[PDB]
Short mmCIF file of C-alpha atoms and ligand atoms in Angstrom, two decimals:
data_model
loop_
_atom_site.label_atom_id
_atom_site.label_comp_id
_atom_site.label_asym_id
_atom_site.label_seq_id
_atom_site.Cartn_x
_atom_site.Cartn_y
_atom_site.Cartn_z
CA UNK A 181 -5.82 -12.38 -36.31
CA UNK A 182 -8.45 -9.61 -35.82
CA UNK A 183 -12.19 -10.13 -35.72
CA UNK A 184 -15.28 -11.06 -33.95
CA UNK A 185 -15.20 -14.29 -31.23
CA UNK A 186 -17.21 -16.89 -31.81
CA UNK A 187 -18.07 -20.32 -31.09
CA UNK A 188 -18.03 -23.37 -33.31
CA UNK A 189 -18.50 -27.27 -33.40
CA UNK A 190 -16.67 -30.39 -34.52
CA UNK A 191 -15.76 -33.86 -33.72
CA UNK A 192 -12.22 -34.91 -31.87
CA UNK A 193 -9.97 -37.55 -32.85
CA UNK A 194 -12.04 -40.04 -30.99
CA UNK A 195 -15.60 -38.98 -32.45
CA UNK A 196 -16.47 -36.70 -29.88
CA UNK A 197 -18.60 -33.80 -30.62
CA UNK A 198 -17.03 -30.74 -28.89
CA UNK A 199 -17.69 -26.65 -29.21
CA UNK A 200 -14.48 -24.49 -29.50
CA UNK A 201 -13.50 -21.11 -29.41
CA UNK A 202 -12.83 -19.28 -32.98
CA UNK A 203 -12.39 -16.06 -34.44
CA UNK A 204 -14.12 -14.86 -37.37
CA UNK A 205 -12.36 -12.57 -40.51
CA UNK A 206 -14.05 -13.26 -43.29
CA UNK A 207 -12.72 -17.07 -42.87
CA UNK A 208 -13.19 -18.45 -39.08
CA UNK A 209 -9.98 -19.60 -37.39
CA UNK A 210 -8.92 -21.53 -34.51
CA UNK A 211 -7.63 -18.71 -31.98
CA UNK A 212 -9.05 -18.79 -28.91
CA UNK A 213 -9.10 -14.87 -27.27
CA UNK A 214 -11.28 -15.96 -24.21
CA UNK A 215 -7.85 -17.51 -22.32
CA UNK A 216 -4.94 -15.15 -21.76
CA UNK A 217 -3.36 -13.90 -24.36
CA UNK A 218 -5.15 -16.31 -26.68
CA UNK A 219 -4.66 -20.44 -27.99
CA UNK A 220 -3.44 -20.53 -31.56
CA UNK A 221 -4.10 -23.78 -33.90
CA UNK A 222 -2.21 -24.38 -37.00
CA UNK A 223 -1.60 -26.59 -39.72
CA UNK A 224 1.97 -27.70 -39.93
CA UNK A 225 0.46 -29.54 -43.34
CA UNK A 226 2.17 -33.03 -43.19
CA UNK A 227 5.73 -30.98 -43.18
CA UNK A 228 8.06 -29.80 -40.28
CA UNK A 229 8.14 -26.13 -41.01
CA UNK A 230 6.71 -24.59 -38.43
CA UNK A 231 4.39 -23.54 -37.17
CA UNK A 232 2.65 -23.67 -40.55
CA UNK A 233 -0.48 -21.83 -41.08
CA UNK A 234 -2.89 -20.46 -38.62
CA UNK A 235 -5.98 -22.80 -38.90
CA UNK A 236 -9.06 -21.25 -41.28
CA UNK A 237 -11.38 -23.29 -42.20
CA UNK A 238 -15.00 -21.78 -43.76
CA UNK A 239 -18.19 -22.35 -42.66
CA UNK A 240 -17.08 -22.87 -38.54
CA UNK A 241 -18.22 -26.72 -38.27
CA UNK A 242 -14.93 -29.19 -37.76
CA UNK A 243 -16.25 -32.47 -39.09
CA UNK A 244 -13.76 -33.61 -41.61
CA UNK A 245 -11.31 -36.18 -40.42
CA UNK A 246 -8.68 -33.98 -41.56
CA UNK A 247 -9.59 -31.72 -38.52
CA UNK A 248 -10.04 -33.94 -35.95
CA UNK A 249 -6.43 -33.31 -34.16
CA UNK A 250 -6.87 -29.98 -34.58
CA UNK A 251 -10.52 -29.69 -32.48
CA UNK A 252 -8.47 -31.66 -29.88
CA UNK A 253 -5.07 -29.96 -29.75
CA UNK A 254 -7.48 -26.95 -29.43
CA UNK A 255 -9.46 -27.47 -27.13
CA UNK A 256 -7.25 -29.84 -24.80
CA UNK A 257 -5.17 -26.63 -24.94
CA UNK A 258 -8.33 -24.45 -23.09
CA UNK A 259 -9.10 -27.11 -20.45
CA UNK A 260 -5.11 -27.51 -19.51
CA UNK A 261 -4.91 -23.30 -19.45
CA UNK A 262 -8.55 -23.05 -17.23
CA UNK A 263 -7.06 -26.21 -15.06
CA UNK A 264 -3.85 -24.02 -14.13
CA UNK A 265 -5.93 -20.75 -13.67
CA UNK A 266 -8.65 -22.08 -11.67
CA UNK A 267 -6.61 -24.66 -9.17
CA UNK A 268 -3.14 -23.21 -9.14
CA UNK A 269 -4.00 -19.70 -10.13
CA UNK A 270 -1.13 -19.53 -12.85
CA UNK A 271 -2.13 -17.53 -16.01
CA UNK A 272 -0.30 -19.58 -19.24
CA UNK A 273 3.04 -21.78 -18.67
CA UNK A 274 4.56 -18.05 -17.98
CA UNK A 275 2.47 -16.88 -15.56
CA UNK A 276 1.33 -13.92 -17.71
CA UNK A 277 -1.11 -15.40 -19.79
CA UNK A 278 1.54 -15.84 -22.81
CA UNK A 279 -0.28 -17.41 -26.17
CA UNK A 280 -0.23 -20.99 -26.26
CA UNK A 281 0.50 -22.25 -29.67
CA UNK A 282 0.06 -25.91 -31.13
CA UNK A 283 0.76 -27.19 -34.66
CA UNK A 284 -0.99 -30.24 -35.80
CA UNK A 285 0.05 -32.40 -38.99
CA UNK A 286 3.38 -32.38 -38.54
CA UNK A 287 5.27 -34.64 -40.47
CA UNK A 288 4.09 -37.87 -42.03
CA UNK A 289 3.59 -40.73 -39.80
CA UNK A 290 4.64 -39.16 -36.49
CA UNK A 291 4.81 -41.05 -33.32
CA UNK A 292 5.24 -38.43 -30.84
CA UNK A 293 4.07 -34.99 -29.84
CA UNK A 294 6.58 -32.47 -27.87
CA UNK A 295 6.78 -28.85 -26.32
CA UNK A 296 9.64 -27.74 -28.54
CA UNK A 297 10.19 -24.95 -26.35
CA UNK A 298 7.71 -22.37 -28.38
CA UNK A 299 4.56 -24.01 -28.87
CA UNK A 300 3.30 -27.35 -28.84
CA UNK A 301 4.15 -30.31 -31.74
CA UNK A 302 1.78 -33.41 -32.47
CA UNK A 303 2.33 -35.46 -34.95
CA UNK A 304 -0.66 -37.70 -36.15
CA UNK A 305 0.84 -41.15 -35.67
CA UNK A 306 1.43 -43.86 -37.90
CA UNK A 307 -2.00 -45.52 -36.93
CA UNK A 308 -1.12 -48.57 -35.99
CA UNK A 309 1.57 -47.20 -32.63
CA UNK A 310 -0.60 -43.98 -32.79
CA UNK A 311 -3.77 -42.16 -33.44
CA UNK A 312 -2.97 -38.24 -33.93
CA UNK A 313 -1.41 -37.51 -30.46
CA UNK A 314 -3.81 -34.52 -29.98
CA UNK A 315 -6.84 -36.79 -28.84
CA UNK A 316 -4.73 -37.80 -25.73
CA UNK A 317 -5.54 -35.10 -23.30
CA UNK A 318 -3.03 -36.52 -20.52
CA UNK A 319 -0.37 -36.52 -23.65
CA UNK A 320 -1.43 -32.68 -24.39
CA UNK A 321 -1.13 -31.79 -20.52
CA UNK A 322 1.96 -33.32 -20.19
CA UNK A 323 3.29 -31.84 -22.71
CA UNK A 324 2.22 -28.02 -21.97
CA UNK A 325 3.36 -28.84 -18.37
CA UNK A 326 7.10 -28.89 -19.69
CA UNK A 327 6.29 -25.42 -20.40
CA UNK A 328 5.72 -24.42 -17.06
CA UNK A 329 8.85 -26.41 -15.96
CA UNK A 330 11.04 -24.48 -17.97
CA UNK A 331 9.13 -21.24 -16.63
CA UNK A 332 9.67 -22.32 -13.34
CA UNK A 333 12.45 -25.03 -11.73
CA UNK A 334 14.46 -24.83 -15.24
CA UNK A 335 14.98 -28.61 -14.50
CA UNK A 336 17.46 -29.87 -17.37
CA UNK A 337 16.55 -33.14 -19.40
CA UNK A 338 18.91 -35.28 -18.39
CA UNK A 339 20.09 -37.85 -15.56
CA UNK A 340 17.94 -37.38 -12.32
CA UNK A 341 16.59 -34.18 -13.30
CA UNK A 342 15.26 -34.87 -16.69
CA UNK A 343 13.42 -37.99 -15.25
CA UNK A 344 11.95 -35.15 -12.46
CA UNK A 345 11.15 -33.35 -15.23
CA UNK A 346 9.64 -35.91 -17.11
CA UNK A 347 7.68 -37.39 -13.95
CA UNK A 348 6.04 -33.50 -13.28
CA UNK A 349 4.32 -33.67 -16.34
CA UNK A 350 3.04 -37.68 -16.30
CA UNK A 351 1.35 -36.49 -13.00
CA UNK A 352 0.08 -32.74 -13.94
CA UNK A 353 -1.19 -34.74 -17.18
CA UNK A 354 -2.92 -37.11 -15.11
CA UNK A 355 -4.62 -34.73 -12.47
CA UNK A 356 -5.68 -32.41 -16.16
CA UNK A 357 -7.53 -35.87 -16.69
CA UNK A 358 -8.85 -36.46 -13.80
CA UNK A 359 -10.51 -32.66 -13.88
CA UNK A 360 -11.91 -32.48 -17.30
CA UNK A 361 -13.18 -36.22 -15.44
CA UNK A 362 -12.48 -37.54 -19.21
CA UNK A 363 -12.43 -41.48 -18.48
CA UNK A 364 -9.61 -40.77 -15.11
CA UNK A 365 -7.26 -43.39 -14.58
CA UNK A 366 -3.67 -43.52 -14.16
CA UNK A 367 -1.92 -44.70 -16.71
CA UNK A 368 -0.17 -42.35 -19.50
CA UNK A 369 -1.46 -42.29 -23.12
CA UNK A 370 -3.97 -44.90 -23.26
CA UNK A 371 -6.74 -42.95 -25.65
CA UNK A 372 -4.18 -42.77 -28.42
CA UNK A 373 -1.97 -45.16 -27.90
CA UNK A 374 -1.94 -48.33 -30.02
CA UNK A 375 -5.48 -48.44 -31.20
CA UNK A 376 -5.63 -52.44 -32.09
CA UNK A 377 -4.77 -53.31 -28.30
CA UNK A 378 -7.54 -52.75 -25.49
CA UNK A 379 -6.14 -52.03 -21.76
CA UNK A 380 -2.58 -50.85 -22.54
CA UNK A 381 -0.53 -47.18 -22.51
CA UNK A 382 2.79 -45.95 -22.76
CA UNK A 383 3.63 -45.95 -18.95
CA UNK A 384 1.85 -46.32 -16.07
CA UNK A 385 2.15 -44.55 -12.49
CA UNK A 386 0.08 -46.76 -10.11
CA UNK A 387 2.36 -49.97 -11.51
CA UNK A 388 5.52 -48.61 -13.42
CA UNK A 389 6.69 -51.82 -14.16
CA UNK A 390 3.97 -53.69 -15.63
CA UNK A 391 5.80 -52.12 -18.96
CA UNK A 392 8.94 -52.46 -17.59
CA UNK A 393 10.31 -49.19 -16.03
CA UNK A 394 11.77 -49.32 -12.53
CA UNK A 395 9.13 -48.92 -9.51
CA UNK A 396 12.39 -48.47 -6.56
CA UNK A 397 15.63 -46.44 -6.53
CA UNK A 398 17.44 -49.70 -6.33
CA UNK A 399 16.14 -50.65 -10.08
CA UNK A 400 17.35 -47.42 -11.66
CA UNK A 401 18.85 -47.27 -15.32
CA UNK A 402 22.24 -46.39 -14.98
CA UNK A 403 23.43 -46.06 -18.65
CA UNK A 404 23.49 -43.38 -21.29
CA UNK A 405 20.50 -43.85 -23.10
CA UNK A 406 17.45 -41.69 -23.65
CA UNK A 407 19.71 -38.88 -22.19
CA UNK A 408 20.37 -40.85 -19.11
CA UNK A 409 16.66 -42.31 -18.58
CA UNK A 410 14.38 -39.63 -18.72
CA UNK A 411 11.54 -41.60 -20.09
CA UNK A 412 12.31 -44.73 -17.35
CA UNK A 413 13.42 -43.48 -14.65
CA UNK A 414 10.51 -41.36 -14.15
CA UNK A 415 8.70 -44.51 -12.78
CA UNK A 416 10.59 -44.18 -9.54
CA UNK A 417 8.99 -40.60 -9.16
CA UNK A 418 5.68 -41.64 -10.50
CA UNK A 419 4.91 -44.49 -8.34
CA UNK A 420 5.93 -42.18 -5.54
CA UNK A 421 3.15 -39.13 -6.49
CA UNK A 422 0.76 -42.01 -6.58
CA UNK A 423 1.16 -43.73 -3.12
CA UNK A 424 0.76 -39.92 -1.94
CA UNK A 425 -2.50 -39.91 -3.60
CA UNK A 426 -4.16 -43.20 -3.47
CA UNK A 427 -1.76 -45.16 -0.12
CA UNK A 428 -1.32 -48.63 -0.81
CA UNK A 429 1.83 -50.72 0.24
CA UNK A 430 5.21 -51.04 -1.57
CA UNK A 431 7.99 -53.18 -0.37
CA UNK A 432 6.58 -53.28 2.64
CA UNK A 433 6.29 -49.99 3.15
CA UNK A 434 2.59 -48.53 3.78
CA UNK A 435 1.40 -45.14 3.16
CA UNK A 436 -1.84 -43.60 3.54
CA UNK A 437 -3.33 -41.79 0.54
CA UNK A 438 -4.21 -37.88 1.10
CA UNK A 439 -5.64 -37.54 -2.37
CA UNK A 440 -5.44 -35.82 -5.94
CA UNK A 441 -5.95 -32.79 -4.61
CA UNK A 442 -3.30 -32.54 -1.88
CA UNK A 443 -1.10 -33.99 -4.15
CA UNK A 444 -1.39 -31.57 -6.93
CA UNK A 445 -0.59 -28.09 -4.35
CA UNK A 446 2.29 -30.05 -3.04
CA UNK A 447 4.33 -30.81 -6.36
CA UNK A 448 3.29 -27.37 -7.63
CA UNK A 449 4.70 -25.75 -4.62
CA UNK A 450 7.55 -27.89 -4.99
CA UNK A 451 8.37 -27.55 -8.48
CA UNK A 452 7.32 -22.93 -8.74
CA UNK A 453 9.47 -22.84 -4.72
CA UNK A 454 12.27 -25.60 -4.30
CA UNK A 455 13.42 -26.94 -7.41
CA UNK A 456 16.49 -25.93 -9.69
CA UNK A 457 17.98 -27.12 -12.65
CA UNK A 458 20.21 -29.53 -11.52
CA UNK A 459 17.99 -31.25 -8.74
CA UNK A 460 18.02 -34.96 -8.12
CA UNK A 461 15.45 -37.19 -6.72
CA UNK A 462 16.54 -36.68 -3.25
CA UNK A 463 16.39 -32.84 -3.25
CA UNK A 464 13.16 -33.64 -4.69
CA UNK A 465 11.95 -35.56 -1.36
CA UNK A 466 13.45 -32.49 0.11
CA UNK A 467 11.29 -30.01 -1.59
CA UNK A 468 8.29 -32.18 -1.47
CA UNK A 469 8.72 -32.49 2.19
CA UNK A 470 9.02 -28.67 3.04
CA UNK A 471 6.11 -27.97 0.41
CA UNK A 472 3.42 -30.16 2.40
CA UNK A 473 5.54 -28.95 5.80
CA UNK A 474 4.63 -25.18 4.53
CA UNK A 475 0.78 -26.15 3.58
CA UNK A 476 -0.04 -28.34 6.20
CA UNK A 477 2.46 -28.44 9.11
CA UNK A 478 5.48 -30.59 10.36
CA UNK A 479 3.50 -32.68 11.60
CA UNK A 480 0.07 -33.35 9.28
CA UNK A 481 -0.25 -36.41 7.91
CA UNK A 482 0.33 -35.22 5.02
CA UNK A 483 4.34 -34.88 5.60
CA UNK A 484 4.11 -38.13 6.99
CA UNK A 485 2.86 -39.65 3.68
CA UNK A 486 4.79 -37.77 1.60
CA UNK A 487 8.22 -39.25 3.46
CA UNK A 488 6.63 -42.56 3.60
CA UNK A 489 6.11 -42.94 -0.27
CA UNK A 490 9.49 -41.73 -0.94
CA UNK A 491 11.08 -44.43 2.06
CA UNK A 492 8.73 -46.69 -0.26
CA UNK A 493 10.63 -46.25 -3.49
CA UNK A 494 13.82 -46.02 -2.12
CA UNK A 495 14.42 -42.47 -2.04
CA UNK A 496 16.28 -41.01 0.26
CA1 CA B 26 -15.63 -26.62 -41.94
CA1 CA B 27 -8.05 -42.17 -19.28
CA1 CA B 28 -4.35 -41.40 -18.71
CA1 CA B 29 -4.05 -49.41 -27.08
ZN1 ZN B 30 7.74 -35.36 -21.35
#
């Protein structure tokens, strides 16, 4: 839309009082123009047209419940674009500042939230497996970081690569978290996930297998479902990213921790330099290796704890 930038105020799905970016034209709307080539917010209206209708709303203040997942998918949608910019220097999931678009609503009792390969898709949960997905901000960075994956390394969803793929965004979702500093820990989907159970999540990277997904190469799923193991496999990966971070021991094998940080420009130089479509875990070890070899030398610690954590999981 045209008109004048502004700033208004509303509550998030979890009660939080936040300020956003709108544009006023006569009604005020939720479109961003201070990030690229703007964030666009629309209501997809309980159906699955999309993307529905841009998001207008009258007097600028957010406070119904009704637009709750739409401050968040908003918002969440700014700090993931200024995380990007700021530490990795990449304008949008294109690298030229391309709109980011999210539809909220969608659907009627919706348990998930997906990139669909345009714009972002949250559904707002049945409330009992989920609040509206959009008050997750790991959940929104994950998602928007499948963008840049299919900008970038192209990696296919499926087999070894989809569980790459699915492990990229589960830790760029996690290090979004940990810089907006909202609550950091290291699990995935914990603020909207199951809202009659304290302490869980969907999946968790520091101890994959507390809910069951493999934590070592050797306890792979072999079979055909959820294209191969996208969604379980991708414990074997995580647990790797976060010995690299934090160290700890793992099968007997130790690694020393270089940090968030570190971690984040080594998988972002792997995934932007090294990786393809059809990678599997062990040309990922590859391109992680000659990432930190390119940043901090053959023979930094930091290449030593990157091959360490993947020896640890069994990755060779
Ligand atoms: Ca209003
Ligand atoms: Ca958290
Ligand atoms: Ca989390
Ligand atoms: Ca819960
Ligand atoms: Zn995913």
């Amino acid at each position: 839309i045209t008109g004048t930038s502004t700033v208004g105020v509303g509550r998030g799905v979890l009660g939080d009082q936040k300020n956003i970016n709108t544009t006023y034209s006569t009604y005020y709307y939720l479109q961003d123009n201070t990030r690229g080539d703007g964030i666009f917010t629309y209501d997809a209206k309980y159906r699955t047209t999309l993307p529905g209708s841009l998001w207008a709303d009258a007097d600028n203040q957010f406070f119904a419940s009704y637009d709750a997942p739409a401050v968040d998918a908003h918002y969440y949608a700014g700090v993931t674009y200024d995380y990007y910019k700021n530490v990795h220097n990449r304008l949008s999931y294109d690298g030229n500042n391309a709109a980011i678009r999210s539809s909220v609503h969608y659907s009627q009792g919706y348990n998930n939230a997906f990139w669909n390969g345009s714009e972002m898709v949250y559904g707002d949960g049945d409330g009992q497996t989920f609040i509206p997905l959009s008050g997750g901000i790991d959940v929104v960075a994950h998602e928007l970081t499948h963008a840049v994956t299919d900008y970038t390394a192209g990696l296919i969803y499926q087999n070894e690569s989809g569980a790459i793929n699915e492990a990229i965004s589960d830790i760029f979702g996690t290090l979004v978290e940990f810089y907006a500093n909202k609550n950091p820990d290291w699990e995935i989907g914990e603020d909207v996930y199951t809202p009659g159970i304290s302490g869980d999540s969907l999946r968790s990277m520091s101890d994959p297998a507390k809910y069951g997904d493999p934590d070592h190469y050797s306890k792979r799923y072999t079979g055909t479902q959820d294209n191969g193991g996208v969604h379980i496999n991708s414990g074997i990966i995580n647990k790797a990213a976060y010995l690299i971070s934090q160290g700890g021991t793992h099968y007997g094998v130790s690694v020393v921790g270089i940090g968030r940080d570190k971690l984040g420009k080594i998988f972002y130089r792997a995934l932007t330099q090294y990786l393809t479509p059809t990678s599997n875990f062990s040309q990922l070890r590859a391109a992680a290796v000659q990432s930190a070899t390119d940043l901090y030398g053959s023979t930094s610690q930091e290449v030593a704890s990157v091959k360490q954590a993947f020896d640890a999981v069994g990755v060779k």
